[PDB]
Design a protein around this ligand. Structure first.
Ligand code: GD
Ligand code: GD
Ligand code: GD
Ligand code: GD
Ligand code: GD
Ligand code: GD
Ligand code: GD
Ligand code: GD
Ligand code: GD
Ligand code: GD
Ligand code: GD
Ligand code: GD
Ligand code: GD
Ligand code: GD
Ligand code: GD
Ligand code: GD
Ligand code: GD
Ligand code: GD
Ligand code: GD
Ligand code: GD
Ligand code: GD
Ligand code: GD
Ligand code: GD
Ligand code: GD
Ligand code: GD
Ligand code: GD
Ligand code: GD
Ligand code: GD
Ligand code: GD
Ligand code: GD
Length: 307
């Protein structure tokens, strides 16, 4: 049992080592820069605005030139705007070469009441391997889920990075998760009120679960694979949706396979496994036309989701 609790800005060039039953609490700094390896055992590494045990305007975390980030415990990044309401260039940038997450990796932002001013967030290790739980949550000052109009944009992966999910991702609240790199494995992605944008050409082995008005959007051309998407439906906790880039010509649902196909006027056909027991007559289809894809063909279903 060792607690370390360190206040103020940090430029850390030494290895970060958290032993079993230990806590390392970095807080109260506006600037954090780590450049060496991380080894987190059965303990907690916390980097945040306020102490793990509970004020600058800004929060900047950079992990860059780190060879290996090995997480076997809890790795928390927390940036809640409390009293503060100034708009700053707050950022979370996680670019280690190797990130192996066997435990819990949890990013928490939000607390925006007035001006819509959220941090830049990019999680793009060259090699990001998740065997554990990756959480991104947007919370109020009290720690409730934030579901307002100020959307936290999160970039996951990049054009040349490799991302593997073998367990769980869960994005909760007003989050736009832009999947900008190759993702593979065999895992669940839980979208609890959040949107996920499949921008890449490899997005494989991921079962997507839409909860509380969560949405799946693809901007890339149709994949080889048929993504399993659970939760299409309309309830009091909202309307979940599947959307593809372009202008929709038609849809077909096969009640015998549980596969829906969305065909665009360009003749691109997107296929998703939504499950059995849908009624064709209760599907709704809309072309959205505006501003990343200008246009989306949006599939919804008028009745509650039944597993
Ligand atoms: Gd040193
Ligand atoms: Gd030991
Ligand atoms: Gd040791
Ligand atoms: Gd140990
Ligand atoms: Gd030990
Ligand atoms: Gd040991
Ligand atoms: Gd500072
Ligand atoms: Gd070790
Ligand atoms: Gd060791
Ligand atoms: Gd060890
Ligand atoms: Gd150990
Ligand atoms: Gd906190
Ligand atoms: Gd936790
Ligand atoms: Gd706040
Ligand atoms: Gd506040
Ligand atoms: Gd594991
Ligand atoms: Gd927990
Ligand atoms: Gd947690
Ligand atoms: Gd927790
Ligand atoms: Gd973005
Ligand atoms: Gd962007
Ligand atoms: Gd969950
Ligand atoms: Gd790709
Ligand atoms: Gd797949
Ligand atoms: Gd939405
Ligand atoms: Gd109702
Ligand atoms: Gd189109
Ligand atoms: Gd086109
Ligand atoms: Gd629109
Ligand atoms: Gd964008």
């Amino acid at each position: 049992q060792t607690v370390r609790s360190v206040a103020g800005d940090q430029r850390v060039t030494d290895p970060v080592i958290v032993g079993d039953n230990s806590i390392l609490d970095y807080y109260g700094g506006s600037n954090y820069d780590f450049s060496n390896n991380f080894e987190i055992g059965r303990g907690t590494l916390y980097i945040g605005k306020e102490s793990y045990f509970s004020v600058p305007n800004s929060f900047h975390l950079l992990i860059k030139n780190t060879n290996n980030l090995q997480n076997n415990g809890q790795f928390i990044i927390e940036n809640i705007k409390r009293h503060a309401n100034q708009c700053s260039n707050s950022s979370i940038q996680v670019f280690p070469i190797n990130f192996q997450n066997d435990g819990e990796f949890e990013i928490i932002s939000g607390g925006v009441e007035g001006r819509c001013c959220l941090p830049t967030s990019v999680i793009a290790p060259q090699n990001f391997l998740n065997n554990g739980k990756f959480y991104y949550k947007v919370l109020t000052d009290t720690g409730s889920i934030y579901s307002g109009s100020c959307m936290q944009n999160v970039d996951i992966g990049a054009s040349t990075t490799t991302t593997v999910n073998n367990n769980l991702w869960e994005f909760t609240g007003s989050i736009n998760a832009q999947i900008n790199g190759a993702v593979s494995g065999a895992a669940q992605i839980n979208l609890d009120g959040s949107n996920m944008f499949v921008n890449a050409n490899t997005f494989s082995g991921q079962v997507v679960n839409l909860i509380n008005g969560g949405s799946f959007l693809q901007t890339s051309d149709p994949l080889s694979n048929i993504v399993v998407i659970n939760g299409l439906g309309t309830s009091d906790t909202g309307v979940t949706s599947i959307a593809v880039k372009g202008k929709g010509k038609s849809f077909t649902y096969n009640p015998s396979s549980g596969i829906v196909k969305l065909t665009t006027v360009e003749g691109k056909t997107y296929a998703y496994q939504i499950g059995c027991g849908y009624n064709t007559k209760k599907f709704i289809t809309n072309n959205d036309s505006g501003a990343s894809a200008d246009n989306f063909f949006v599939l919804t279903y008028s009745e509650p989701y039944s597993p």
